[PDB]
Amino acid sequence: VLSEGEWQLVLHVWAKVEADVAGHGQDIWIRLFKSHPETLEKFDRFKHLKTEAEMKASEDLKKHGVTVLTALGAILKKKGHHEAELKPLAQSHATKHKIPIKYLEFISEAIIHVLHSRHPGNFGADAQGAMNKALELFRKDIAAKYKELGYQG
Ligand code: HEM
Ligand SMILES: OC[C@H]1O[C@H](O[C@H]2O[C@H](CO)[C@@H](O)[C@H](O)[C@H]2O)[C@H](O)[C@@H](O)[C@@H]1O
């Protein structure tokens, strides 16, 4: 359970992400797909992208980043009371997309890397710790739902 202070560190940096969610999403995809190429294979719609240039030029990938980060933002704004938001997400990711918890760890790492790079003014050690705590809570709760849905994760 995160403290209100921790949630505020999370929400304060997210406020910066929201100045341009599309741009942050692109950086996150590039970071994720380069650090862990295997994750790209899970996207039938994007697995043909061969380079960072192609990823950057993809309007659909950009749009999906907006979708993903907006969904994550809604979860973070719930400050732990995200039961309703997690249900549809866990169901599609467990049953249709088949995304292991390990891959969720990979994208969490990419998110933190990008925030660390773009936002040193709001992403110092304490802020990063709070964000990591929030993402771990997210993954913990997703894992529990995966279990209920019958997916090993
Ligand atoms: C921060 C974690 C994540 C969030 C908030 C998230 C959110 C979303 C949302 C909102 C959608 C669209 C609706 C749906 O199908 O549920 C989606 C689709 C999808 N997600 Fe995720 N996702 C996350 C992580 C991942 C990861 C790590 C992978 C893959 C390694 C993944 C693979 C997919 C796939 C394959 C789709 C379908 C894309 C398409 O439209 O072709 N997701 N995700
Ligand atoms: O922070 C680094 C550790 O990250 C992962 O573990 C955290 O998140 C898991 C959920 O994805 C939890 O099960 C675990 O309890 C958390 O500590 C990773 O699995 C660990 O190997 C890393 O050391």
Query: Does ligand 2 lie within 6 Å of residue 139's CB atom?
Result: yes
- List the residue whose alpha carbon is closest to atom 20 of ligand 2: 105
Contact 66, 59 (CB under 8 A): no
Q: What's the half-sphere exposure (Cβ side, CA atoms, 13 Å) at 11?
A: 14
| CATH number of the domain enclosing 24 | 1.10.490.10
Q: What is the dihedral sign for C-alpha 32, 35, 41, 47? A: positive
Q: Which two tokens stand for residue 70?
A: 């907006």
How many whole angstroms from 59 Cα to the centroid of ligand 2?
A: 33
Binding residues for O2: 64
Task: Give the span between the Cα atoms of 87 and 71, in whole angstroms.
Answer: 12
Look at the chain and report how many structural domains it folds into: 1
Task: Give the span between the Cα atoms of 133 and 104, in whole angstroms.
Answer: 14
3-state secondary structure 59-115: HHHHHHHHHHHHHHHHHHHCCCCCHHHHHHHHHHHHHHCCCCHHHHHHHHHHHHHHH
Q: Residue 127 belongs to what domain range? A: 1-153
- The technique by which this structure was obtained is X-ray
Query: What is the experimental resolution, given in Å to one decimal place?
Result: 1.5
Task: Give the span between the Cα atoms of 33 and 37, in whole angstroms.
Answer: 5
Contact 91, 149 (CB under 8 A): yes
Q: Which two tokens stand for residue 34?
A: 């380069």
Contact 11, 74 (CB under 8 A): no
